[PDB]
Every structure is written in C-alpha cells, then in structure tokens.
Amino acid sequence: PVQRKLDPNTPFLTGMRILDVLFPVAMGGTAAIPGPFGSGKTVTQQSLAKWSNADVVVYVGCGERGNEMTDVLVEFPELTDPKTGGPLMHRTVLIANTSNMPVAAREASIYVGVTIAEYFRDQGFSVALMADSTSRWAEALREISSRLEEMPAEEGYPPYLAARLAAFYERAGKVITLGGEEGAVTIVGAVSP
Amino acid sequence: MIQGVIQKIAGPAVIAKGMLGARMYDICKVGEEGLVGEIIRLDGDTAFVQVYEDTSGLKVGEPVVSTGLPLAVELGPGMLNGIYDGIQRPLERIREKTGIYITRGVVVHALDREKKWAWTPMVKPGDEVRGGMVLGTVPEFGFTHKILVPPDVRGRVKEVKPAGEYTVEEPVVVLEDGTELKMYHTWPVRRARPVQRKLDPNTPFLTGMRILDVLFPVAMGGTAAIPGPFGSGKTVTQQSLAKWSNADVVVYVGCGERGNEMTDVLVEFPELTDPKTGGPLMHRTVLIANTSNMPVAAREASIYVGVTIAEYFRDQGFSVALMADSTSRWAEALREISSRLEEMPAEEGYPPYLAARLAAFYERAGKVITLGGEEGAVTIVGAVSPPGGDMSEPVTQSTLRIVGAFWRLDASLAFRRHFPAINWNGSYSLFTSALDPWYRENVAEDYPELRDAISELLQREAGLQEIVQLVGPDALQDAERLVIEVGRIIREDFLQQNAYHEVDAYCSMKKAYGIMKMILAFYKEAEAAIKRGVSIDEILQLPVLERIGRARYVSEEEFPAYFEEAMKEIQGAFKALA
Amino acid sequence: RRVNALEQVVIPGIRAQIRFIQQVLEQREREDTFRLKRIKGKIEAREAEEE
Amino acid sequence: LLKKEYTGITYISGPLLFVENAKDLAYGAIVDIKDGTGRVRGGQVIEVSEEYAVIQVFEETTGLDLATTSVSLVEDVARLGVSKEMLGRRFNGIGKPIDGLPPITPEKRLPITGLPLNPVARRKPEQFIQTGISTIDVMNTLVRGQKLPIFSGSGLPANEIAAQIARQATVRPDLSGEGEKEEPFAVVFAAMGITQRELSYFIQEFERTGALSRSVLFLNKADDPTIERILTPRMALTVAEYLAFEHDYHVLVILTDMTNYCEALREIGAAREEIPGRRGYPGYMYTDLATIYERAGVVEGKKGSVTQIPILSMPDDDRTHPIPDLTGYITEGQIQLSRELHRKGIYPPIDPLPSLSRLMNNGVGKGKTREDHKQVSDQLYSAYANGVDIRKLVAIIGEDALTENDRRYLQFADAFERFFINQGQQNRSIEESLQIAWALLSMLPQGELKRISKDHIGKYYGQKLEEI
Numbered sequence A: 001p002v003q004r005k006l007d008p009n010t011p012f013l014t015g016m017r018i019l020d021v022l023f024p025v026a027m028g029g030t031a032a033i034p035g036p037f038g039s040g041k042t043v044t045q046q047s048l049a050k051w052s053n054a055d056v057v058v059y060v061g062c063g064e065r066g067n068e069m070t071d072v073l074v075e076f077p078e079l080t081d082p083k084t085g086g087p088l089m090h091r092t093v094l095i096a097n098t099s100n101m102p103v104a105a106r107e108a109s110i111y112v113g114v115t116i117a118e119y120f121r122d123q124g125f126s127v128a129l130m131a132d133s134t135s136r137w138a139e140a141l142r143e144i145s146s147r148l149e150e151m152p153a154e155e156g157y158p159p160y161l162a163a164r165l166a167a168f169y170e171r172a173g174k175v176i177t178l179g180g181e182e183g184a185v186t187i188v189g190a191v192s193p
Numbered sequence B: 001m002i003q004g005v006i007q008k009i010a011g012p013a014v015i016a017k018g019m020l021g022a023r024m025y026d027i028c029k030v031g032e033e034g035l036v037g038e039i040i041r042l043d044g045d046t047a048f049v050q051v052y053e054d055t056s057g058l059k060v061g062e063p064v065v066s067t068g069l070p071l072a073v074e075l076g077p078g079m080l081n082g083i084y085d086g087i088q089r090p091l092e093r094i095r096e097k098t099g100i101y102i103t104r105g106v107v108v109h110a111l112d113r114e115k116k117w118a119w120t121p122m123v124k125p126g127d128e129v130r131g132g133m134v135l136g137t138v139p140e141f142g143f144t145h146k147i148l149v150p151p152d153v154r155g156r157v158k159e160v161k162p163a164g165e166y167t168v169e170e171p172v173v174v175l176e177d178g179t180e181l182k183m184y185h186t187w188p189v190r191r192a193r194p195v196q197r198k199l200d201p202n203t204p205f206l207t208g209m210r211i212l213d214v215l216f217p218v219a220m221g222g223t224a225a226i227p228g229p230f231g232s233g234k235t236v237t238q239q240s241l242a243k244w245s246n247a248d249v250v251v252y253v254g255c256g257e258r259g260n261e262m263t264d265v266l267v268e269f270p271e272l273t274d275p276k277t278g279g280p281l282m283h284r285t286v287l288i289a290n291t292s293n294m295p296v297a298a299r300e301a302s303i304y305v306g307v308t309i310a311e312y313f314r315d316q317g318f319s320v321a322l323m324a325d326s327t328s329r330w331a332e333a334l335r336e337i338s339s340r341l342e343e344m345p346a347e348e349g350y351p352p353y354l355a356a357r358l359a360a361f362y363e364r365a366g367k368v369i370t371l372g373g374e375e376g377a378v379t380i381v382g383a384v385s386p387p388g389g390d391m392s393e394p395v396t397q398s399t400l401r402i403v404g405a406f407w408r409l410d411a412s413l414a415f416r417r418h419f420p421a422i423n424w425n426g427s428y429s430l431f432t433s434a435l436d437p438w439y440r441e442n443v444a445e446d447y448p449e450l451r452d453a454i455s456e457l458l459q460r461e462a463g464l465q466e467i468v469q470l471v472g473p474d475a476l477q478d479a480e481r482l483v484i485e486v487g488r489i490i491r492e493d494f495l496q497q498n499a500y501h502e503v504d505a506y507c508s509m510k511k512a513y514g515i516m517k518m519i520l521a522f523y524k525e526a527e528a529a530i531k532r533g534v535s536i537d538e539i540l541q542l543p544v545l546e547r548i549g550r551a552r553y554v555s556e557e558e559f560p561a562y563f564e565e566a567m568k569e570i571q572g573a574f575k576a577l578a
Numbered sequence C: 001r002r003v004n005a006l007e008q009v010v011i012p013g014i015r016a017q018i019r020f021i022q023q024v025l026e027q028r029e030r031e032d033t034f035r036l037k038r039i040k041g042k043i044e045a046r047e048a049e050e051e
Numbered sequence D: 001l002l003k004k005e006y007t008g009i010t011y012i013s014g015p016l017l018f019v020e021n022a023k024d025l026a027y028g029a030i031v032d033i034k035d036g037t038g039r040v041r042g043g044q045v046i047e048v049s050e051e052y053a054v055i056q057v058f059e060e061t062t063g064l065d066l067a068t069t070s071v072s073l074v075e076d077v078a079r080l081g082v083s084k085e086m087l088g089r090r091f092n093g094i095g096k097p098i099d100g101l102p103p104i105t106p107e108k109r110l111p112i113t114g115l116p117l118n119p120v121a122r123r124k125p126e127q128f129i130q131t132g133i134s135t136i137d138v139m140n141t142l143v144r145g146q147k148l149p150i151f152s153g154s155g156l157p158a159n160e161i162a163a164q165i166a167r168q169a170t171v172r173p174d175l176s177g178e179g180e181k182e183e184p185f186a187v188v189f190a191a192m193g194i195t196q197r198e199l200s201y202f203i204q205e206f207e208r209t210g211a212l213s214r215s216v217l218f219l220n221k222a223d224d225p226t227i228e229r230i231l232t233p234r235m236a237l238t239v240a241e242y243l244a245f246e247h248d249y250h251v252l253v254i255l256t257d258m259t260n261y262c263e264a265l266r267e268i269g270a271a272r273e274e275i276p277g278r279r280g281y282p283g284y285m286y287t288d289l290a291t292i293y294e295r296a297g298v299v300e301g302k303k304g305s306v307t308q309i310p311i312l313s314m315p316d317d318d319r320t321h322p323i324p325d326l327t328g329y330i331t332e333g334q335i336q337l338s339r340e341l342h343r344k345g346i347y348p349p350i351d352p353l354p355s356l357s358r359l360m361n362n363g364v365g366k367g368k369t370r371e372d373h374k375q376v377s378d379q380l381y382s383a384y385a386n387g388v389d390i391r392k393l394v395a396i397i398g399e400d401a402l403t404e405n406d407r408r409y410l411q412f413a414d415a416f417e418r419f420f421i422n423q424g425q426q427n428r429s430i431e432e433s434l435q436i437a438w439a440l441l442s443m444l445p446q447g448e449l450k451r452i453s454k455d456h457i458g459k460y461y462g463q464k465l466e467e468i
C-alpha cells in the first residue's frame, strides 16, 4: 500500500544518446524493448544497470543464459558506483533463474523481484527494475495452463495472460510512501517475439 | 486362434468382443463373408478392428476369427511373370474364377499351390543348417531358384526328399526338432530381413542412358529420385531403365496410378523383349499394380511388399532394381489413413511421421553380403510429382534429405522436344568420386578429366545466356560464338536420346567416351584454328561436324572403325586445310 | 532498369507475404482441430459413462 | 536385488499401454516389456496414479496382447555406465557397442538428464581455439566453453566443415604468454538421422586422419527407433561432462543434425495429444533444447572445459523457422553458410554478415593470440557492409555510379572473397591467417584504414600477396 501516486517529472538518465534524447522515459515510467535474437536487449539492460542514476538496481534473469548472469557476478564488483564511489555490486540485487532450471519457478521470480523493488521504494530510494524476458514467463504460464487442460487463447496462451501483465506493470510509478517520503520504481522489460 | 463376435459397427471400424488373446496389428477375418481387417486397439475383452472392404450389410453377432500373424507376404517360386495388387493377390487367377469385377471376400493364393516344380537337393541328412543357407535348387525361366531356410530357423537335418516333381506345399527337409521346411515361407512386410555386412558403393549402375551414366551417375545399391511437373517424361524414363539396365530382376510398383495409365503399362510390357536373351521381358520382372479405387490400406502397403520381394531376390545373390511410380499418391494414402486415426496433422495435412516412413523405405537399398556368403545389391528409384512446381513440397523436402542422386526434369525442355528433359543446372549426384577409381581402372585413364572438361564446357555456355538475351548471337565475339556453337553441338549430339526411337534408346560407355574424345579434339583444334586466322567463319561448316553426328548412330561393333575415321578426318582437316 | 527492379525487388517481396499468410491460415486450422478433438472427447465421456 | 513383474495390462493403443495395479512404479522410471514370444522392448513411465500407470513404448507395439504381456521395472532413474576406456570405441544411440569389441567395465553410473550448473560455480570463458579457418578464427573466433552452432541449408558441405574442424582444431598455449605445454584434447561425436553414405564417410575420415584413438562416436541410423534419436545427445553430453569435470580433459562436442532431433521430438509429442506450437512442434521445445545446449561451459577451480558445435540444416533461407530461431535464443552466436558463395565455387562458404560470435571480445586482445587481432577484425569487417549495398545498387543501375576509389574498394572485396574466405582444404595457422589478412590490408592506403592504430601499421603493413 501507498498514499498517493504522482505524475513523473524527472528523467531516468540511462547514459545512451538515442534513448535519453529521442525517446526519454521518466522516473516512475515503464518501457518495453522487443526484438529478435542477437539484437542487443541484454547489452542495453546491462548498460542501464551500470550507468543509470537509480540508487538501487534489481535485475531479474527470468529464463535466460547462465553466462549472461556469470558476467554480472564477475565484472560488477570491480566497477565503481557512479553516485556513491563504492563498488557497483553493493547497490545491485540479482534474481537468477536460468533456462534449464525448473520451469514453474519462472513465475515466482518476477513477483519476488517486483516485491523487493517495492520494498526498497518504501524507504525513500529510487529503484530501477529490469526483467530479462517476459516471454519465458508467458511460456511457463502456457505450460501450467496446459497441465490444467484449460481452453487456450491465440497461440496456446491462457486467456488471462494480459491480466497478469497488467498487474505486473502497474506496480511502477512515483508514489508518496506511508512514512511520508517519496520513492519511485521504473520497469524496463524485454520481450522476445 | 481366438474367435469373437461383433458388438458394434460404425463405418469401417468394428468392435469385437471375446477377443482376449488377440495381438496388435494382426490380420482378422470379419463376418460370414470373410472380410479382412487389422486390429488397432486392445481394451479388456474387446478389440477394435479396421475392415479393408465395404462393411455395408453386416449384422451384429457375426463371428470374427484371427489369423495370429500381421501383414506378410509369401516368398517362393512362382513370383516371376506375375501381376499382384498391394497385398499380393494374383489378378490373373481372380479374373478366371470371378470376371471383370472384383467381388469382395474372394480367397486366392499368391503362389500356385498345384504347379509341379523340379527339385534338386544340395544337402544330406546329418548336416547342420542355419538361417540364410541354401538347400536345394529349382529351375525357373532363365534363372535357377534357390530354396532358402528362413532366417529365424537353425537346426540339424535328417530328411531329404529325392529329386522329383513336387508342389511348393510338400515338405522337402525335416529337422531334428520336428521343423518342416517347405519351398516357401512368410515374412512380415514392415521388418527388414537380416544381413551379414553392408558394403560401400564401388560399382556403377549402368542405366544405358548417356547423360545419366556420365554426368549424374548412381552406384549399385544407391537411391535416386526423379521429380518434375506433370507431362515431363518420368514413366518413359523408368521403363527405359527397366528395359536396358544391367539389373537381373526388376520390380515395378504402382502406388495408385490412374486406370488408363495402368492399363497402358499392363499392355505394353508383355510386348517388350529382353535385350540380354531375346525372350519376353516379363520373365524377369514382377509387377505390383494398384488403381485409385482400390482399398486405401492396399495402397499404403504397396511399397513395402515390393521392397520385401526385392530383398528376397537380393538374398539369393542377384542384383535387383526397384522402380516405384509416384510416391506422392502413396503419401496421400498415408495421409488418409492418418486422418482415419485422428493423428493431429503437422506439416500440411501429412502426419508428423512421414519422414520416418520415407527414411525406413529408402534405407533398405544397399549392397550387402548375404547370410549364405554371396553378394547382392538393391537399387531404388522413385518418382515425385510436386503439384506446385517448386521443390518445397513436403514429400519432396523429406525425400531430398535421404537420396544420393536427384534427376530433376523440366517441362520447358519438353516443349523444345529435347528428350530426355533433364535439367543439368538443377540435377546433382553424390556418387562420382567413389566411382572414379572404378572408372579409370576399367573404362579409361583419361575418362574423369574428359568428363570434367565436358561439364566445364557446358557450364561456360550457361554463363553467356544473359548477353544473348540483350543482343543477338550473331553480334557476339568469334570465340564466344565458338563456345556457343560447341555447347549447342554437345547438347544436340550428346545429351539427346529418344526413347520411342528404336536405336536411339540405348548407349554404351565406350561410345560415350569416344564421342566425348572426338568433341574435345574438335573443340581444341577449332580453338587453335581460330587464332590461325584462316576461314574463321567457315570453321562452323567443316565436314567433320557430320562425323560428330554420325557417331550417335554407329553400332558398337562398328564403333572403333568410325572412331578412327573421325579422328583421322579431324587430323586431315585441321592439320592440312591451310 | 525496370526489368531488373521488378525481378530483384517486387516478386520475392510478394512471395514472402504469400508464404506468411499460408503459414498463418494453416496454423489456425491446426488450432481448431484440437478444439474439435476436445469437444468430441467431452461428448464421448458424458454420454457413455454417466449413470 | 529381487525383481518384480506386473501383468495387469488393461489398455493398449498406439505407443501407450496402461498397467492397472502398478502403484509402486516411480514417475519417470524405465521398464522392460516382455511378451509371449520372449522379445523384450523398452518403455518409460510418463504418468503414474492410484488407478493405473501410463507407459509409452520405445518401439512399435506389434505382437503385444493382454494375455501374456508382463512389465518389469529396470531402475527408477535412467543412468549410463561411463568409464575412461570409452575413448576409441563406438556406440549406438542407446549406448551399446557396435564395433564388435567386448563391452566396457563401468566406473560410475550417471543420470543422463544431468543437473543444472550453479551460476556461482561457473566462470567466464577466456581461452581462444585455433580452428584453421580464416573466416572463423579472425572475425567470429571460438572460445573454450562456447556453444556456437553452424546454420546450414540443404545441399551444402556442412559435414565436410565439421570434419575439417574436428581434424584441425587445437589450442596453442605459447601464444597466451603462459608458456607452451601439452593439454589433453578429446572429441565426442554424436550423430542422429545419419544415412549409410554419411556414416561411411565419417568413419573413413576419422580412420584416415588417425583421430579415432581420442574420440568417442555415438551413431544413430535413420532406420533405428525414434526414441534412440531423443536419447542420443544426452548420453554424449553425459560422457563429455564426466570426462571434462572428473579427468581435466578438454572435450569438443559435435551434434551432427538437430533438425532430425526436433522432428523426432515432434513425432513423440503429437502422439500424446497435447497442444502444438508454431509449426506443429511442441510448445515445450525451448526447454527441451535448453536442457541440451546449457550443459557446456567451464567450472571455477577445474581445468576442464566443454565446447559444443551443433550443426543444423534450415528448411530454406528461412531464418524464422522455429528450429534455427529457438537455437539462436539459447546459443551464443551462429555461423551461417551462404548459397551464393557456394554457387560460384568458394569453399568454405561462410557469409560474414549474418555471422556473429558473442564471446569474441573475451578471448582476443592484449596477452592472447596477438594484440592486433581485434583491430584487424574490425578493419576486415569495415568494408563488406557497404560494399554489399554498393553491389546491390549496381545490380539495378550499373557501373555508372562507381568512382575510382570505389573500384579499388570493390576489387579489394572481390580479392577478399577469392582469397580470405576461399581456402579449400587448408590448415592455416592463426599467424599465417593474420599474415594473409595483412597482405590483403596492404592493398589499400593507410589513410583509408580508419580502424587500426598506426603502431600496428608500422610493423605489419606492406606485405604482398602470399598465396600466389
């Protein structure tokens, strides 16, 4: 719970010219970055994790490769936090669920990440949340609905697929917390058609 | 065997009760009329059978009797000079007892049970026998038919029937354990016959046609596919291969062809003659014939009976060629059978396991050492008819991944009346390099380089087809016109073979080698004579070009004399004209 | 120039669209066959095993 | 240990059979099925309940009946007996010898499904592999621990390229500054859907090279049962993981055709009546492929490594088909063969534009191979992406638009396609491949080479063409 939701009025500085200039996203907004394989989604999300002005960064590896998450564990302690001067990994929380790990756990990771991001929002920080791929979460929903022998929607997905995505993206926004301070959550989610 | 009664009739599906003990995929006899059926289900005391024939008129309570065996064929003497349907029923003997229609429920035997055969034993009591051995010989037309112990039988012999005339039903050899061996044995059509060892392809399959033997060869034991749009010339090419190849036994499979074309091939074949011996051609061939109105289960089993018969004639040591008419209709029958069983189609309407069946059919071809110690080979040639013209049709796509040779035909070359209509820019073969050691050690040492020169010259002429499309061929350069005329000569006097023509339908290897040698010599000498700079336009009308075309129709026995004549004419023309 | 442009640009562009539409329609038919199977199975169960 | 048999078969249809009183069968267990004739078949429990258990049969169900069929449990988890003596041997798709030699003596029995690696336990791939092909080694280099599939069409020499890579690939330790020392290199070769003409070619090439003494072959013919096609690559990966992470080997794994694996997967799923996917393939294909490709990599504190090079054939130039698409989302790059380069005679026909290596930046640079590798790769790539567009525009308009420097640049592009990409059956080292690239680089002025620094120009520029 919160008190109020406010209109975003400050930019979310990502450090990339085309995204910061042509297509800005505000502190508390949402964004989606679709594309085929080998396009540049993961590198963009990792650059946002390195160079953004958010205080706390939560990274959710829903159903992707393991080397892409090992790179984060190796490289990040050797870098520098842009706004505090310490190690970069001291502000970052990782939720990892690779592609060969159990399928039903993909649904839990998204909710765990968004719950942690909301928790750090209540303390007055500015949180940036990155989801590696929501299409894997959709595939997990498809498999679970297939086990229940439910009637499918287009392309076999369950008909309540859009409601879950609406309930996930709605958690972002700049709010006034119950304690009186001001926090914000911004969500950038990659889609894999 | 187990006997039961009917408790449900719904279309071609019949549910029987009391059938506890029946096995899957067995052949059952349904009703008082005796219709054949196949069991595909088991549930408690009941089993689901699927009737091949028409079920109209059946009543609940009629008996069902199981034969205890799956679909199988009878292998033995009497299969040559015969015509069979998809499940091995003799069409000639049915017509004798019934008429011009095929009444359902008729019972006939694949092998004539009342014909006497001469028997000559080759074993004595006290011997030990194992599956695949030879025990006895029987004369049959120009062949000698060998009696084989079935592959699944081993034992010790103490009984020999002496030399005399017996029917195939009479036992000839009785083993110590009570096993009686006859002149025939059964074998399921969907289980491949065992072999000792599978060999590599090292000997060519002599098709008798110049372009197929030289440019796109197939080895003994290989597989080839000949696709193309309708009206291309597949059937005549397959018949020419059946007539003139070096294979000992030919098997022809009709997978559901049109009635009039089946009548055409049924009438034409008895009039043909065997080129090896001069007798009728049907004395060495076995025909499997189906039309479009036959039961759909008989159409699916057509290609398995033929390949099982071909494997049987392989075990005796002969070389077998298996020609199969268009497998697209066989795939259509398979699709219909799958739709009868609700199999959730995957590709277009085809079942997901079409490629597995096609692979299982094509993998039986090969050169092997039989269980008796002899060597035999089986070659499979199949036809495809993609309706869309493009080779992206699912059956063609599945076939392209498991074949070694690919003889694509084109309809446009048929409109120009250039036959055979082989597209040399789309066809390919993967057997050239392996056949190269055989070629140079037997035909000639310079044969592969000469063949590569011919193919290179054909490739060069295809690169000039753009310039001909803008400007006329007369405005082209003298050397370019030279190579264009050489390509035209090569095409019209080397790649042409008319099949309806009486002496244009066959070509040996030595004739082709001599023609290629003459063509290369003429090309090289004319290329030098162009830079010689004398009569450069009159080079195209030299009298040597008559000798080049004359070698197409020269007899093989008269061929060396005309070869010397043409070579010395090339010498006397190019060396001493000017 | 016009011949080369038509040969190299327009025809494969139309052909790809034709292929895409064919695949979509075939996938829709494959989807509805599954629903027909499910409703046939539901018809069989309730009309033969209830009491 | 005592055995148990269940004879309560109640329903047989297609590939499935139902056993009534078998409550003590574990989920996913492996059973053997024996009928009245004594023939033994295989099966797996796919669904178990209180009323009955569902078992699918590995092969055809011909000859089975409800009167004499009995089902006996083999083991609860499908396991493979592995040993160090398997090097030099050949196995079928289920792990039995086919060479006629006596069967091995197992050391351990490992589950073939494996276990997921802990992301904390992995480490970053960093060591370069010299394959001998200039297009691969320079522009799309391969790193120990990578999974880099080869995208091929129908009628292209994928098998010959795979054999050449198997023959020529090794790591040179002296180039890395660590000093020269021998390292144990092994090859695990898995083949499925392979016809006899390809099987003989692979066996003959391996015997002629002499590489059979250090390789293990898993071969599955096209007329074999389709369950062995599913179970073939898992056993090869189980052997490779055991060797690499328990004997410090460096193992290179080649999967000959994944298109046949996907077709066999489609055949199995469609008989179990579940919802299909994009082109009839099952919807869980991504997870099933991920359980195969993700088993490679390196482990912290261990000297071993596993490298995968799958070969798959696209149905067309269709990059959007489900099989190469879902392969692209899991793997770390692709090497794509070009039909245009094959048509004009270039061998091997690797097209640099759709190709990509995602771990190139970690295995190149200062201290590894040579310090000019990345600069040379950038300079070699810098021409093609604009030269191809120039050639496309010329194919419509003509030669009128080209200037003189553009003519030089297109001549360099033609010489590039004729010399660098085309090498035939060569065995180039990385040093001589760099020398050939630099000899091509000396055909352009130093002022136009806008990528390489002038330190590298001052010590490598000016070499004339070497392969003539």
Ligand SMILES: Nc1ncnc2c1ncn2[C@@H]1O[C@H](COP(=O)(O)OP(=O)(O)OP(=O)(O)O)[C@@H](O)[C@H]1O
Pocket (backbone or CB within 6 Å): A035, A036, A037, A038, A039, A040, A041, A042, A043, A044, A192, D328, D329, D330, D357, D358, D359
């Ligand atoms: N900003 C960039 N600068 C340089 N190279 C880049 C950049 N973005 C992407 N690349 C290159 O393209 C590759 C794309 O990798 P990336 O993980 O970003 O792709 P992706 O779209 O997430 O793919 P996938 O769906 O397969 O996970 C990188 O490995 C790198 O080689």
Ligand SMILES: Nc1ncnc2c1ncn2[C@@H]1O[C@H](COP(=O)(O)OP(=O)(O)O)[C@@H](O)[C@H]1O
Pocket (backbone or CB within 6 Å): B229, B230, B231, B232, B233, B234, B235, B236, B237, B414, B419, B420, B421, B497, B498, B499, B500
């Ligand atoms: N070698 C040949 N000589 C003469 N005519 C040929 C030859 N090959 C093909 N044709 C012609 O091609 C046509 C197609 O013949 P056929 O094989 O019966 O039909 P399809 O090609 O559709 O199976 C025939 O009319 C025949 O005249």
Ligand SMILES: [Mg+2]
Pocket (backbone or CB within 6 Å): A041, A042, A064, A068
């Ligand atoms: Mg990614």
Ligand SMILES: [Mg+2]
Pocket (backbone or CB within 6 Å): B234, B235
């Ligand atoms: Mg025809």
